[model samples]
Target: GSAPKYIEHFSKFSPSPLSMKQFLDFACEKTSFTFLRQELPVRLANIMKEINLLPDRVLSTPSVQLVQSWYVQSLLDIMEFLDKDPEDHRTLSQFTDALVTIRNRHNDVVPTMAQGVLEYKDTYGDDPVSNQNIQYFLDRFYLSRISIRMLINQHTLIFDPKHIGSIDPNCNVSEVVKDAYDMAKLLCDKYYMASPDLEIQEINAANSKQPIHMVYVPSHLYHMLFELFKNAMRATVESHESSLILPPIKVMVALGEEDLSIKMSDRGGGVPLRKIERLFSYMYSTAPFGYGLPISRLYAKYFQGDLQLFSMEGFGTDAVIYLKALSTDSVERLPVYNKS
Candidate 1:
């Protein structure tokens, strides 16, 4: 979605990765856009834009693929600003407080979304619909916060000696593979229970082309993937039409030489072209408080791997997660950096 008119007006004076002049021109031309309803001070809007640009500057460093993840997050700050009315200090304060709480509670094992949802539930009540909205608020409220944390964590460990650790000292490659498959199955089952219209299908195991393996990953990062799958499943379930024959969703796990590849493909019509590129960009969402894809991508990159997207307008969307493989030898050979 496009920025509001006031935001566009601020964008003119602000430096942005996207064209400033174009944004300004667009902002000046009044239209029926709903976001343009709010009137904001040009200075405050400019400050918001500056905050968003901070991570982009760091992304220019060559040794920091992991650090680039922060860029996705920094955009979240801008999103929160856009979401709130400029005049509403109380709303802004509440959003900031919620973000601080999230930061204090975040750990390496729990997915931010799941944790946020739980926290929101505890703070609010047990209403699922309200919980969803609250979670959505937090998701957008602190997208940048979570994004930057992932980047910083990844960058600090990029060349560290402990970067790769065994998934389990006792489990062999085949054993890990089995465990991964089982885990995937369990998740799909749970997901189906939550949203039955989501069709989960398995490709012919023997005919599957990808090599399958499992690696130990940080618990927090793992949850991120789980959340992505859950969202995809929910989307499919809610949007399914009886008249239209939708394809089954597929989840595949493969072992790579240096990483583990997990692929999730769904029949939900792919994200629109205009929004596709920004899917992983911070605060860019087709839905209210959209930060899922970007945050997922940020976490994926934290493990010395990446999250990739492949989709066609007529076809469905596929998300590929590459996670660094852990092995005894690799753990011992983890790269070290020397600071002068």
Candidate 2:
């Protein structure tokens, strides 16, 4: 019997509900072979080497792009060398031919994997809190790498394996503290307007060795303190209008060994008794979407610090923020520790 072309091959076969599944299975099997033949070796080699050699476990797309650009430039340089000398043509031709194939394959997978990972993050792990976590990890990872690079660049002295040794004994501690305070004050003034009703009085204790030291706090967290003060000042100013004497808004600054503590007291009246505990919780604002207390507390914790609140319903509320102080001195010498 003569074969009836396409019908002879498939007419006798019956299609079933699972035929689509069979088709997909067949396709996948063929695709696997194609992938191995055209894409496997270079892709696998590059990824394996990258994973093994990279200090950071995670690689961003920009980093991968940088590597790819370097590879391409190296190939171009080799090509240029081959052009200058025909004696090396045979070997260079073979190498360049192989590289062309491998580079194409590399391009296919590198971007695809990068994009797939980012999409997966967006779809499955893109919550605001999750994004924040990833950003925090990335920031720490990069900072550590930067620190290592800086150390290598400095060519500074390395300590011995045993006991610690001092470097230059001429370093001034009081001067550093004063400089930090000046910086903090500058930042505060830039970000916030001084509340006319609230006065920040700097008290210098007589016979003190150094004017009370102010802690060096990171800028992000310090902004929160400004916000809180602004809110209290606004409340005080708004309440005092119409006609009458304005009540005083008292703020006190004190220095401890580990922290510079600021206590802001408002005579305008305390927060509602019910909202006291929730004051520092995110989204628990006295006004709509107030971020003052929550962010302040977060900054405090970030710097190994603390914030305390004391209030009397009919009287006033005192908001205290503790900023971690930077010092080379030992803990035992710290004023707060000595008092204990």
Candidate 3:
């Protein structure tokens, strides 16, 4: 970040300090200040807007609130850390703490935001908001929110590398699915009366000498698949504890010329369409920070793909996810920043 510009914004947000060369030097050394200041004013304004728009009740949710109140504190904590005199907050420990808090906040919203976008089309069909004439506001909402979210993820990759990975090199989609299945099943087994079996079937392309495969961010695939399967297995086990036949959760992966599709089917009691939107809302959580199917949808949309859910009242749910088979670029973009 440009020292002068950051200082300018800093002073505006809160009263600030005299130069501490060592502190500034350390902060500068740890991050790409150049990138931080690239869209300095715009991003700053947007972030402030976000902070202003937060529901006041977030911090006041005294009951078993899904909107973890900790998130409210976490955001303020981030700002407090950032606004501190460089020397005061200038320790590896402090930096790491800030980074983790930011990551937690970033993770908290992906699912809910994604759910909002995915449902807008169907949920508001024929409504005034659905009219093209009034669409600009909705468009702006997504742009502002996603732009901030994108930047937050970039910061995680840039400054918090110990546990986070960058977006690059496509991962094997089929392999990711298999791993997700195991993890999901294990998690379900720990809580459910009986976890259903999981089966994966992948067919290689006929004309190619190599096996058919797809590439995408491995972590993203794992997250989405794991969340889905966890839900599926949970539903199945809970629905069938008294039944003699426990159905298997089926996963099918197929590759085509331009698209890769994975379909997961489970025989849990079906979710009502009215409540389908609620699943993605992820409106509440017990974890310090939580994620949901919307994150999966975000991943899907990120890769120019999409995910859809179908269910029968008492049968089960089928999650059909599709992704572009291969792409030179992904929705998540990382810029190389080098200090002068």
Candidate 4:
């Protein structure tokens, strides 16, 4: 009748973020496996515990229930190997096997949870209060999900002889922007037969001397940029339907003493002020099944970073993404439970 000990214990604290430097250092250390053995189980269990604490109605959604079960099973699987003798060499492989399986099971998690939220909204009706509750729950839930996946993948990748895990210690900021634009452009082109150009530049704000390349996870950077790029591309193409060519979208990277800021400026006709706030709500979308903006924001905030938007009506919109410049400081920002 009681929850697992690991889950119960970890739910009390926020999950810590792993910086690119920290991951690289750990990967190169001889005691890497030992450190992971002691840490991964607790991190995974924290997420499991958090999901378990979701409101009854939200937890009851079929897809969400499935997602919850996956986390539960993953915790059980990891603990099984963890409880084994530390000196047993076979324990490493067994534990990692479980981690790989856990990672695979989560591949469809985002879409599944999106569907669950949609279903819940359909059944509960979209009163403003209930909608806000769901959005708040989602922000916590998705960030927790990101923390869990990062831990599992990072560990599993470490065990691969050919791989160096997921973080890129010198991840290039400009390249990430271009790479995101490449992917988003394809989609934009397919739907509208056109996509806007992307212009990326750097600004060394006085007292800010960090280079465009810093310690960061390339994939996370790409994910956040890709979503914003997609939105910008769509907005530009739609607004310029009669024009001969779409104006370029500008991305400026400002290197600060403590933070790296990216401003994505677009020529898409700006949104009304009234509509800006709802853009973050899951239920509000100009495009069907729009989870991009909210999820993108979560990726930023997960590492003490942020995503913000400012629009000049009838002119354009500017999306800003802020990231911590120092590796050690860019830790995970998980939601913690404070029992009242």
Q: Which regions of candidate 2 fall more than 4 Å away from where they truly are?
A: 1-195, 203-209, 286-291, 326-340
Q: Which whole-number lDDT from 0 to 100 does residue 247 have in model 4?
A: 97
Q: lDDT by residue for model 1 over 93-167, one digit each (tens)? A: 444443343334334212433443344334444554563443343333243343334322322223123322212
**By the TM-score metric, which is better: model 1 or model 4?**
4
Which 10-residue span in candidate 2 carries the lowest summed lDDT?
Answer: 331-340
lDDT (CA) per prediction: 0.42, 0.40, 0.54, 0.77
| Model 3, span 55-113: residue lDDT tens | 45322333213333333444344444443444443553464556456556545454444
Q: What are the TM-scores, per candidate, against the unseen true structure?
A: 0.40, 0.38, 0.58, 0.89
Candidate 2 total steric clashes = 0
Worst 10 residues of 3 by lDDT: 15-24
TM-score of 4: 0.89
Worst 10 residues of 1 by lDDT: 331-340
How does model 3 fare in lDDT?
A: 0.54
Which residue runs of candidate 3 sit more than 4 Å off their true CA positions? Answer: 1-33, 39-44, 50-164, 168-170, 203-209, 282-290, 332-340
